[model samples]
Target chain A: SGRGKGGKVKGKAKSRSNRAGLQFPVGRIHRLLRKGNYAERVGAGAPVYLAAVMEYLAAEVLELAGNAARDNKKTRIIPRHLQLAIRNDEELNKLLSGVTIAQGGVLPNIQAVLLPKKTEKKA
Target chain B: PPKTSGKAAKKAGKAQKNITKTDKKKKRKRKESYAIYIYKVLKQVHPDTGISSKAMSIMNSFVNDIFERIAAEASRLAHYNKRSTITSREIQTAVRLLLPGELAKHAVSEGTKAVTKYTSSK
Candidate 1:
């Protein structure tokens, strides 16, 4: 009976509701937090709080990405747009420093050409 | 010739004094980073673990970035509220906006406790 396509799930909405009117599964967040094994016990509202934070971060990144896309005169968001957005932001760059993002896989090695003179001398 | 020479001498003396004043100001305006505090906190957390130079540099930058955001947000909040001074409430709200959930909660509580203790002591 509840097997209809695009079926709505009730009661589950409460756990997935974000304070900012977004939807993120609090159960998944709660489970992941517990799996980290760093904390002995997790609070009841912790997952909801984490979900809200994740929503905020997503919004922030997307906002930057949207600006990047507009700056490039593109109507759609691309990997290069995201890379530029994150790389240009000092805080986001620091947070994602270890991340390697693929940007169109066909770009030239421009970074190599732009390398500082000090590195060339050391090499 | 004597009068012109005396005027030139006074000008040279004034320029030298201005250079000294600027040098003193620059000496007093040295920039201080939060690397020392970061290292100290890391030591306190994990005494046996040592951080790499690059990692320490990143940590320093991260601390500076977050500090800048909090201060900027707090100031903006104060400005929006038409308040001349930023109080603990503004800082608390700024932390809420900048930091993630549980971390912001812990930080707000700690800051509130510290402020309370400080005020009580006075």
Candidate 2:
């Protein structure tokens, strides 16, 4: 686009940030991976919504991770949770982006995503 | 001898590559944005994990695990504070109540001790 769209509007950034307010720490993300790795069963590579995923991470993922191995608590959703919300219901799948039921993978679809990898210097 | 093996391996590799690009314009399926978060988390731990569209259900289930746990834990605390909405205090309480064996007892005791010390100092 034209230089990332020149716009100096009042409260635009605030409104956008407030529209979906959530932050995720890296710890929960680590837990999700552990869940995926050693589970008797788990979904394979699925789409991750950055905003929604952030919500789940801060609010839900930690408890799930801790309880799973510790006590017998059940947390059935991860940061990648929206995928389940739409996995079975084709109608819901339509609401979800980058999902095509009975279709191939969907994680690489960056256009329909809220979070993509930011530019990071690889060590 | 090494040269013949290399040539055969190259021929097989070319055949596999040809199949990888097929009927139509041949594109790898893209995953959803949320899935990226999962991969990022996993990437730090499992450097060798691979990605393809085929692993969708496994991913979805993991997400569900967390959602349900948080919901359940939150619900458990609601009974403790019937007149009020669940707050961080409630969550902290829930943590104390739900933590098991030595940890639960220790957390609550340690937490109480910390609060006591602070109040006395004040």
Candidate 3:
């Protein structure tokens, strides 16, 4: 059999075993790396390194969120706390803009939709 | 001449002027000089290269600016948490936010090492 479904199954099994302490599967890690000298495969420790980096980012964001919750005198972390956590942070806000869908501005126009036809005609 | 408050105001102003001069001196004293640390790190990077005093001062200020911004941002992060103490996570976030991609990766690794070392030593 050429590189068939059996070969694909074997590849997945191998990656799972190697991904002991990593958050992301090594197979995905290999694909995520840019097209380079080792484009087809990642190094053995690459996934672990990526996991450690992600852990650092998680810890940082969690700390900020925790602080934000306490600042608002709430034991629970709400979306407001999360919003306040990154609101004043320029880079964090920029990163959030990339990850989250921005809703169009919703202020100063709630009554705009219900404007009378006469007022619409006058303006 | 109606000079009672005017005479006293002149004396008070002269006294406060000297106080402002001392405040400026104190502000100058607060700016840390990183010349020695910069020289030691530069030596490690390039053992044989000679550094000019002018170059050293420039580098010193540049390094100070980097650390100052990191410190300020990290502290603000801490304060946002309602925290009086700054933890390493805030510092990590500051490094990531301030430094670009590869530079951030290296900084995070180095900081992790330093933080682990400090924590274990304590």
Score residue B84 of candidate 3 by CA lDDT.
41
Off by over 4 Å in 1: A1-123, B1-30, B116-122
CA-based DockQ, model 2: 0.01
lDDT string, candidate 2, A15-64, tens digits: 54442312233345445434433212112121122222223332233233
Ten-residue segment with the worst summed lDDT in candidate 1 chain B?
B1-10
Candidate 1 local lDDT, B1-122, one digit each (tens) = 22332322234445444564323222233244444444444444334444444344444454444444454554556667765344555656765664555656665454445444542110
Model 2, B1-122: lDDT tens digits are 22332322234445434654433222344232345455554444333433334333454344544344433444455545552233445444444333333444443444455344542110
| Candidate 3 chain A minimal-lDDT segment of 10 residues | A98-107
TM-score of chain B of 2: 0.40
Q: lDDT of all predictions, in order shown?
A: 0.45, 0.37, 0.45
What residue pairs are clashing in model 1? none
lDDT of 3 by residue, B2-83 (tens): 3333322234455434464324222333343444444444344334434444334444444444454554554556656765
Task: Choose 2 or 3, whichever is better by lDDT.
Answer: 3
Clash count, one per candidate: 0, 38, 1
Q: Name the docking class for model 3.
A: incorrect
- The stretch of ten residues in a row with the least summed lDDT in candidate 1 chain A is A98-107
Tens digit per residue, CA lDDT, model 1, A42-83? 344333332233333333544555556567776554556444
